[PDB]
């Protein structure tokens, strides 16, 4: 569990940063604050909308937020009525204005955060993790994902002792930096306590 986080070592490699913007040493601090703020706001408000990830950019002292989501219609709302409000609210903490660019994930079951949020939505319903894991692995293999390693840890269906469990399938070369491997860690609240869900997804050799 102390093993290296796969995304961090490939940030200079095959994993471009979710927020790509330069700033001077003075305002960089505040811009990180605002970044964390908008990421929280968009996280909470769009939580039920199953956003996969939010790609911040800040050209010319103005923010442009790309948004990869599983269900673009539920995010946008009826004919964009939400989008504008999302631009106003965000712009207020963004330093003004707030451009936004929607984007749909063609294969949402592949993407890690969508999978984890699904598994959490199953766990809150008291669904059995032993089924959830095999279901995720089933969808991953049906899409032909080159590799996968699902892992979870916690109370496990009310057991008094916390326990780790996992189920890998396919080739999983974590040591190979050439590898195209998505990854996520998402906590799942339950009546007995938090249950961490880690999800490795090996998409391709390059």
């Amino acid at each position: 569990g102390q093993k290296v986080h796969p995304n961090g070592i490939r940030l200079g490699i095959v994993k471009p940063w979710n927020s790509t913007w330069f700033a001077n040493t003075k305002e960089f601090a505040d811009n990180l604050d605002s970044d964390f703020k908008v990421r929280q706001y968009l996280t909470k408000e769009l939580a039920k909308a199953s956003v996969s990830r939010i790609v911040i950019e800040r050209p010319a002292k103005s923010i442009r937020v790309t948004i990869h989501t599983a269900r673009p219609g539920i995010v946008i709302g009826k004919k964009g009525e939400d989008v504008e409000k999302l631009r106003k609210v965000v712009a207020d903490i963004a330093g003004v204005p707030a451009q936004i660019n929607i984007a749909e994930v063609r294969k949402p079951e592949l993407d890690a955060k969508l999978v984890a949020d699904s598994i959490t939505s199953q766990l809150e319903r008291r669904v059995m993790f032993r089924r959830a894991m095999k279901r995720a692995v089933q969808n991953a293999m049906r899409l032909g994902a080159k590799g996968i390693k699902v892992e979870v840890s916690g109370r496990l269906g009310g057991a008094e002792i916390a326990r780790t469990e996992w189920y890998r399938e396919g080739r999983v070369p974590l040591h190979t930096l050439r590898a195209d491997i998505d990854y996520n860690t998402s906590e799942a609240h339950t009546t007995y306590g938090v249950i961490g869900v880690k999800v490795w997804i090996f998409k391709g050799e390059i």
């Binding site: 200079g12 790509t20 913007w21 330069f22 700033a23 001077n24 950019e57 800040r58 050209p59 010319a60 442009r64």
Partner: protein
């Protein structure tokens, strides 16, 4: 007459922008010196890895910052207009000077 010194993080991300600005320059009258690669600043960092104790175990980091000089000699109107509001390049901070 003009001395531009642009900067960005990733080299591969700044290169195509350098190509676009040099090309924008060549088409607008050119009179270009030829961009200078410049030394790259590399801020070293070493943060404690653990939430508590484990003083022996630390994690290294760095933030490379590539810079490039441009140096256009002509004070041409076509040049100063092309250098204005065609810079684009998100994530790449340009600094014009005369």
């Amino acid at each position: 007459r003009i001395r531009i010194r642009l900067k960005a993080f990733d080299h591969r991300l700044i290169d195509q922008a350098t190509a676009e600005i040099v090309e924008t320059a060549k088409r607008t009258g050119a009179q270009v010196r030829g961009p200078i690669p410049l030394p790259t600043r590399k801020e070293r960092f070493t943060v404690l890895i653990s939430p508590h104790v484990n003083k022996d175990a630390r994690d290294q980091y760095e933030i490379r910052t590539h810079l490039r000089l441009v140096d256009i000699v002509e004070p041409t109107e076509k040049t100063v207009d092309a250098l204005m509001r065609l810079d684009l390049a998100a994530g790449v901070d340009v600094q014009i000077s005369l």
